[PDB]
Write an enzyme that holds these catalytic residues in place. Structure first.
Site, mmCIF file in Angstrom:
data_model
loop_
_atom_site.group_PDB
_atom_site.id
_atom_site.type_symbol
_atom_site.label_atom_id
_atom_site.label_comp_id
_atom_site.label_asym_id
_atom_site.label_seq_id
_atom_site.Cartn_x
_atom_site.Cartn_y
_atom_site.Cartn_z
ATOM 1 N N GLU A 169 0.873 -1.151 0.000
ATOM 2 C CA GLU A 169 0.000 0.000 0.000
ATOM 3 C C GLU A 169 0.911 1.202 0.000
ATOM 4 O OE1 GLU A 169 -4.057 1.638 2.261
ATOM 5 O OE2 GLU A 169 -3.194 -0.368 2.689
ATOM 6 N N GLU A 221 -22.149 -2.603 24.582
ATOM 7 C CA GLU A 221 -21.087 -1.780 25.135
ATOM 8 C C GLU A 221 -21.262 -0.307 24.761
ATOM 9 O OE1 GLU A 221 -17.122 -3.422 24.929
ATOM 10 O OE2 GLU A 221 -16.418 -1.782 26.253
HETATM 11 N N1 LIG Z 1 -5.424 -9.789 23.540
HETATM 12 C C1 LIG Z 1 -4.060 -9.724 23.021
HETATM 13 C C2 LIG Z 1 -4.118 -9.569 21.625
HETATM 14 O O1 LIG Z 1 -5.521 -9.028 21.262
HETATM 15 C C3 LIG Z 1 -5.730 -8.871 19.807
HETATM 16 O O2 LIG Z 1 -7.035 -8.363 19.538
HETATM 17 C C4 LIG Z 1 -7.278 -7.109 19.952
HETATM 18 C C5 LIG Z 1 -8.567 -6.576 19.300
HETATM 19 O O3 LIG Z 1 -8.723 -7.068 17.914
HETATM 20 C C6 LIG Z 1 -9.535 -7.120 20.040
HETATM 21 O O4 LIG Z 1 -10.683 -6.398 19.912
HETATM 22 C C7 LIG Z 1 -11.799 -7.187 20.322
HETATM 23 C C8 LIG Z 1 -12.530 -7.699 19.065
HETATM 24 O O5 LIG Z 1 -11.661 -8.472 18.255
HETATM 25 C C9 LIG Z 1 -13.764 -8.537 19.432
HETATM 26 N N2 LIG Z 1 -14.435 -8.857 18.185
HETATM 27 C C10 LIG Z 1 -14.741 -7.744 20.305
HETATM 28 C C11 LIG Z 1 -14.013 -7.163 21.535
HETATM 29 N N3 LIG Z 1 -14.932 -6.284 22.265
HETATM 30 C C12 LIG Z 1 -12.765 -6.351 21.177
HETATM 31 O O6 LIG Z 1 -12.178 -5.978 22.422
HETATM 32 C C13 LIG Z 1 -11.431 -4.776 22.351
HETATM 33 O O7 LIG Z 1 -12.308 -3.709 21.850
HETATM 34 C C14 LIG Z 1 -13.343 -3.135 22.820
HETATM 35 C C15 LIG Z 1 -13.753 -1.846 22.353
HETATM 36 N N4 LIG Z 1 -14.345 -2.102 21.020
HETATM 37 C C16 LIG Z 1 -12.710 -3.024 24.224
HETATM 38 O O8 LIG Z 1 -13.770 -2.791 25.126
HETATM 39 C C17 LIG Z 1 -12.072 -4.312 24.556
HETATM 40 O O9 LIG Z 1 -11.660 -4.317 25.961
HETATM 41 C C18 LIG Z 1 -10.929 -4.526 23.710
HETATM 42 N N5 LIG Z 1 -10.229 -5.808 24.175
HETATM 43 O O10 LIG Z 1 -8.992 -7.052 21.583
HETATM 44 C C19 LIG Z 1 -7.683 -7.083 21.500
HETATM 45 C C20 LIG Z 1 -7.036 -5.847 22.153
HETATM 46 O O11 LIG Z 1 -7.353 -5.810 23.540
HETATM 47 C C21 LIG Z 1 -5.534 -10.190 19.114
HETATM 48 N N6 LIG Z 1 -6.647 -11.157 19.532
HETATM 49 C C22 LIG Z 1 -4.254 -10.844 19.451
HETATM 50 O O12 LIG Z 1 -3.161 -10.052 18.884
HETATM 51 C C23 LIG Z 1 -4.013 -10.943 20.915
HETATM 52 O O13 LIG Z 1 -5.036 -11.777 21.458
HETATM 53 N N1 LIG Z 2 -7.098 -9.669 1.885
HETATM 54 C C1 LIG Z 2 -7.869 -10.766 2.471
HETATM 55 C C2 LIG Z 2 -7.874 -10.753 3.890
HETATM 56 O O1 LIG Z 2 -7.859 -9.292 4.400
HETATM 57 C C3 LIG Z 2 -7.641 -9.125 5.849
HETATM 58 O O2 LIG Z 2 -7.540 -7.736 6.114
HETATM 59 C C4 LIG Z 2 -8.648 -7.060 5.776
HETATM 60 C C5 LIG Z 2 -8.571 -5.781 6.603
HETATM 61 O O3 LIG Z 2 -7.901 -6.158 7.863
HETATM 62 C C6 LIG Z 2 -7.732 -5.015 5.894
HETATM 63 O O4 LIG Z 2 -7.904 -3.677 6.137
HETATM 64 C C7 LIG Z 2 -6.703 -2.978 5.846
HETATM 65 C C8 LIG Z 2 -5.949 -2.643 7.150
HETATM 66 O O5 LIG Z 2 -5.488 -3.835 7.740
HETATM 67 C C9 LIG Z 2 -4.702 -1.757 6.946
HETATM 68 N N2 LIG Z 2 -4.359 -1.155 8.246
HETATM 69 C C10 LIG Z 2 -4.882 -0.635 5.911
HETATM 70 C C11 LIG Z 2 -5.728 -1.038 4.687
HETATM 71 N N3 LIG Z 2 -5.992 0.137 3.847
HETATM 72 C C12 LIG Z 2 -7.050 -1.725 5.046
HETATM 73 O O6 LIG Z 2 -7.637 -2.121 3.801
HETATM 74 C C13 LIG Z 2 -9.068 -2.107 3.678
HETATM 75 O O7 LIG Z 2 -9.735 -0.975 4.355
HETATM 76 C C14 LIG Z 2 -9.638 0.375 3.669
HETATM 77 C C15 LIG Z 2 -10.614 1.235 4.265
HETATM 78 N N4 LIG Z 2 -10.029 1.763 5.525
HETATM 79 C C16 LIG Z 2 -9.962 0.179 2.177
HETATM 80 O O8 LIG Z 2 -9.727 1.414 1.513
HETATM 81 C C17 LIG Z 2 -9.138 -0.899 1.575
HETATM 82 O O9 LIG Z 2 -9.508 -1.012 0.150
HETATM 83 C C18 LIG Z 2 -9.395 -2.166 2.235
HETATM 84 N N5 LIG Z 2 -8.507 -3.270 1.649
HETATM 85 O O10 LIG Z 2 -8.069 -5.321 4.324
HETATM 86 C C19 LIG Z 2 -8.582 -6.519 4.273
HETATM 87 C C20 LIG Z 2 -9.958 -6.503 3.558
HETATM 88 O O11 LIG Z 2 -9.771 -6.098 2.191
HETATM 89 C C21 LIG Z 2 -6.414 -9.851 6.319
HETATM 90 N N6 LIG Z 2 -5.149 -9.219 5.726
HETATM 91 C C22 LIG Z 2 -6.405 -11.276 5.918
HETATM 92 O O12 LIG Z 2 -7.425 -12.023 6.671
HETATM 93 C C23 LIG Z 2 -6.625 -11.487 4.452
HETATM 94 O O13 LIG Z 2 -5.497 -10.981 3.746
HETATM 95 N N1 LIG Z 3 -11.135 -0.613 19.702
HETATM 96 C C1 LIG Z 3 -10.258 -1.091 20.762
HETATM 97 N N2 LIG Z 3 -9.519 -2.166 20.473
HETATM 98 C C2 LIG Z 3 -8.680 -2.679 21.427
HETATM 99 N N3 LIG Z 3 -8.592 -2.097 22.653
HETATM 100 C C3 LIG Z 3 -9.346 -1.011 22.907
HETATM 101 C C4 LIG Z 3 -10.184 -0.508 21.986
HETATM 102 N N4 LIG Z 3 -10.842 0.565 22.470
HETATM 103 C C5 LIG Z 3 -10.402 0.729 23.729
HETATM 104 N N5 LIG Z 3 -9.484 -0.234 23.978
HETATM 105 C C6 LIG Z 3 -8.641 -0.709 25.021
HETATM 106 O O1 LIG Z 3 -9.301 -1.557 25.777
HETATM 107 C C7 LIG Z 3 -9.608 -0.901 27.108
HETATM 108 C C8 LIG Z 3 -10.940 -1.104 27.547
HETATM 109 O O2 LIG Z 3 -11.754 -0.424 26.616
HETATM 110 P P1 LIG Z 3 -13.353 -0.079 26.831
HETATM 111 O O3 LIG Z 3 -14.043 -1.131 27.687
HETATM 112 O O4 LIG Z 3 -14.018 -0.121 25.478
HETATM 113 C C9 LIG Z 3 -13.527 1.658 27.510
HETATM 114 P P2 LIG Z 3 -12.695 1.904 29.169
HETATM 115 O O5 LIG Z 3 -11.262 2.353 29.029
HETATM 116 O O6 LIG Z 3 -12.769 0.677 30.047
HETATM 117 O O7 LIG Z 3 -13.466 3.162 29.905
HETATM 118 P P3 LIG Z 3 -15.072 3.027 30.234
HETATM 119 O O8 LIG Z 3 -15.294 3.074 31.719
HETATM 120 O O9 LIG Z 3 -15.829 4.093 29.471
HETATM 121 O O10 LIG Z 3 -15.545 1.664 29.813
HETATM 122 C C10 LIG Z 3 -9.328 0.631 26.741
HETATM 123 O O11 LIG Z 3 -9.111 1.394 28.004
HETATM 124 C C11 LIG Z 3 -8.338 0.607 25.968
HETATM 125 O O12 LIG Z 3 -7.075 0.339 26.657
HETATM 126 CA CA LIG Z 4 -14.230 -1.196 29.970
HETATM 127 CA CA LIG Z 5 -14.858 -3.336 27.077
#
Ligand SMILES: NC[C@@H]1O[C@H](O[C@H]2[C@@H](O)[C@H](O[C@@H]3[C@@H](O)[C@H](N)C[C@H](N)[C@H]3O[C@H]3O[C@H](CN)[C@@H](O)[C@H](O)[C@H]3N)O[C@@H]2CO)[C@H](N)[C@@H](O)[C@@H]1O
Ligand SMILES: NC[C@@H]1O[C@H](O[C@H]2[C@@H](O)[C@H](O[C@@H]3[C@@H](O)[C@H](N)C[C@H](N)[C@H]3O[C@H]3O[C@H](CN)[C@@H](O)[C@H](O)[C@H]3N)O[C@@H]2CO)[C@H](N)[C@@H](O)[C@@H]1O
Ligand SMILES: Nc1ncnc2c1ncn2[C@@H]1O[C@H](COP(=O)(O)CP(=O)(O)OP(=O)(O)O)[C@@H](O)[C@H]1O
Ligand SMILES: [Ca+2]
Ligand SMILES: [Ca+2]
Ligand SMILES: Nc1ncnc2c1ncn2[C@@H]1O[C@H](COP(=O)(O)CP(=O)(O)OP(=O)(O)O)[C@@H](O)[C@H]1O
Ligand SMILES: [Ca+2]
Ligand SMILES: [Ca+2]
EC number: 2.7.7.-
Lengths: 252, 253
Positions: free
Chosen positions: B67, B145
């Site tokens: 990219e 949430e």
């Molecule tokens: N946990 C360590 C690392 O976390 C990564 O994923 C990160 C991120 O995608 C993932 O995001 C997950 C999503 O996916 C899942 N589909 C719903 C879930 N609410 C969301 O959770 C995250 O987003 C929320 C805010 N919307 C926050 O409230 C939440 O605490 C935060 N953990 O949480 C992780 C960061 O906290 C990968 N799993 C892996 O690299 C490794 O497990």
């Molecule tokens: N390509 C097939 C699959 O895509 C996944 O990632 C998906 C998603 O994370 C990823 O999103 C990527 C991000 O990550 C990265 N940080 C910047 C990049 N511009 C963004 O790309 C996507 O979102 C943009 C909108 N903001 C669009 O403009 C863009 O066309 C689109 N490919 O693009 C994929 C969907 O097109 C994983 N790579 C893997 O499971 C497998 O390769």
């Molecule tokens: N989209 C995201 N993906 C991964 N981690 C996130 C995230 N958004 C927030 N976080 C991380 O995960 C922690 C918990 O996030 P949340 O539960 O969504 C809000 P919070 O910080 O606990 O304050 P709150 O009292 O409003 O809930 C954040 O404090 C931040 O460290």
């Molecule tokens: Ca929280």
């Molecule tokens: Ca949370």
């Protein structure tokens, strides 16, 4: 009826219930358990959920339990030490939003300083990773956003302009957070903390006032505000040495 | 760089074929297919649109992307092995309506064995259960949430986050309806405009989107009413369509 009001003490009682269930279920494969998020900072509000992390000895462990009781919500992440450490040392465009979790860990169970190791890893990320992430953010996010609002100016839809303006302000906040290598406290305070930081790109604060106030209906003002921010970006990056490669038509 | 410049569809296709030739030259017989997606793949690119391209590799575990910008235009090329791409095309995340339209309009430019058709067929053939699970996860992981976040805002602030949160909720509702109808939105700009013309919306959603689409997001009291009404509509809607999760246990593992 959606999330209910809960006090800090009730959330911690829930936490220790989850701790005991984890230890009973997984036993000696549990290296450490911590609370992060606002409960980990002891700043959870009435409607805040519970976020917990678990370090497992099982190699390649990567799973989560996320659920509601109808009244409150819990998320528990289970990672091997390696997977958790590698994620903590990785800097994406949204690192200022996400990696505050490793700066807020309230340890609940820890057999060998694993949570301290996770914290040390997160705070010791090499400066170059923030540099690379900033350059990636400009190309992958800001430049694409600029194409989106320039398309809107010539062909609409203006109905997308308020949403895009929100996204741009957030991306700008990530840019500032990556530059200062500081994580925002919580998502709700991302913009309010971003505009109190030093060294803002020209036009950023003016754009944020639209998003923070909600006055996003004057689409001509917004497009001009986005352009001024985009212009300030090139000056800001050149002033901070976040130079983006534009020399190759095909860089592979 | 002066930001994205105006480009015609003809110029963008000239760029695509230069990229195709370099891909074929560099990887040779490890290229199974090259296609264009995004607005250029739909031949609806606007003057300032960028170029989005996909490539299927025979190399196992190939998963990389190039990219970059020239300062005037921006390109993204994703390279996936067939297995990784087919797997990704058949998983339904909460943002499936946002992401997986890419597999339904691929403009083919190179294909050694119908791989691009196989990706499309894989994307359209996802089992109904995967959408059901994604919808139930979305309610728990996102909507519930968000509801706590705006309820926290009402009692302790900050209202300065409310316009942003409201945009996020409208987008999540759009994912919810798109998952329900198994419809992918065309582009990000049309997500809300297409979500609100879908049948059988949760009560209060179209009114919430009208706040977000019009930009009239300064009346914190009216937004909070509107988020609650949409949250109520969600409870009615999920429960009427069977998007029910057992929530009876304090700890469900
Ligand atoms: N946990 C360590 C690392 O976390 C990564 O994923 C990160 C991120 O995608 C993932 O995001 C997950 C999503 O996916 C899942 N589909 C719903 C879930 N609410 C969301 O959770 C995250 O987003 C929320 C805010 N919307 C926050 O409230 C939440 O605490 C935060 N953990 O949480 C992780 C960061 O906290 C990968 N799993 C892996 O690299 C490794 O497990
Ligand atoms: N390509 C097939 C699959 O895509 C996944 O990632 C998906 C998603 O994370 C990823 O999103 C990527 C991000 O990550 C990265 N940080 C910047 C990049 N511009 C963004 O790309 C996507 O979102 C943009 C909108 N903001 C669009 O403009 C863009 O066309 C689109 N490919 O693009 C994929 C969907 O097109 C994983 N790579 C893997 O499971 C497998 O390769
Ligand atoms: N989209 C995201 N993906 C991964 N981690 C996130 C995230 N958004 C927030 N976080 C991380 O995960 C922690 C918990 O996030 P949340 O539960 O969504 C809000 P919070 O910080 O606990 O304050 P709150 O009292 O409003 O809930 C954040 O404090 C931040 O460290
Ligand atoms: Ca929280
Ligand atoms: Ca949370
Ligand atoms: N956040 C996202 N993540 C993954 N794919 C996305 C995405 N947002 C949109 N898409 C998918 O990737 C394709 C390209 O997205 P974008 O380049 O960002 C807008 P577009 O669809 O090309 O119209 P436009 O560039 O003329 O505004 C979309 O058609 C869509 O299927
Ligand atoms: Ca595009
Ligand atoms: Ca793109």
């Amino acid at each position: 009826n959606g999330p209910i009001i809960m006090t800090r003490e009730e959330r911690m009682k829930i936490v220790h219930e989850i701790k005991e269930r984890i230890l009973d279920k997984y036993g000696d494969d549990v290296k450490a358990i911590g609370v992060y998020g606002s409960l980990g900072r002891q700043t959870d509000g009435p409607y805040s959920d519970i976020d917990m992390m678990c370090v497992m000895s099982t190699e390649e462990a990567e799973f989560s339990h996320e659920w509601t009781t109808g009244e409150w919500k819990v998320e528990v992440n289970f990672d091997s030490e390696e997977i958790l450490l590698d994620y903590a040392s990785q800097v994406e465009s949204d690192w200022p939003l996400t990696h505050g979790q490793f700066f807020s860990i309230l340890p609940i169970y820890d057999s060998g300083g694993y949570l301290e190791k996770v914290y040390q890893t997160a705070k010791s990320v090499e400066a170059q990773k923030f540099h690379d992430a900033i350059c990636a953010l400009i190309v992958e996010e800001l430049f694409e956003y600029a194409g989106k609002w320039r398309n809107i100016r010539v062909q609409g839809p203006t109905t997308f302009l308020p949403s895009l303006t929100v996204q741009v302000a957030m991306a700008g906040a990530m840019l500032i957070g990556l530059h200062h290598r500081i994580c925002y406290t919580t998502s709700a305070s991302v913009l309010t903390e971003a505009v109190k930081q030093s060294d803002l790109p020209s036009g950023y604060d003016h754009l944020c006032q639209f998003v923070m106030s909600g006055q996003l209906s004057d689409s001509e003002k917004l497009l001009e505000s986005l352009e001024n921010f985009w212009n300030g970006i090139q000056e800001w990056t050149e002033r901070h040495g976040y130079i983006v490669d534009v020399s190759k038509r095909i860089p592979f």
